[PDB]
């Protein structure tokens, strides 16, 4: 029938959405 | 015997009339069953699509 369905979740996952953007050990 | 001629001639008459009857039904019901098959494919077809 209709309205059926399984959802299946999708997350962004890059250096932005991790904290690791500007992730540098040296001045 | 004259009235029972006309029966016997009026319903043999009307047999002929009822066998036309029945291939009218049968060439209309011929017609429907393509009809549902092809109503039958596109719904697989939507279940496919969404």
Partial sequence: NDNQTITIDLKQIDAKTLGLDGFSVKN | ?50
Wanted: hydrophobic residues 35%; without cysteine; glycine residues 6%.
């Fill in chain 2, 1 to 50: 015997a004259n009235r029972f001629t006309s029966n016997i001639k009026g319903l043999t008459q009307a047999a002929r009339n009822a066998n036309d009857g029945i291939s009218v039904a049968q060439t209309t019901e011929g017609a429907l069953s393509e009809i549902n098959n092809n109503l039958q494919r596109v719904r697989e077809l939507t279940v496919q699509a969404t």
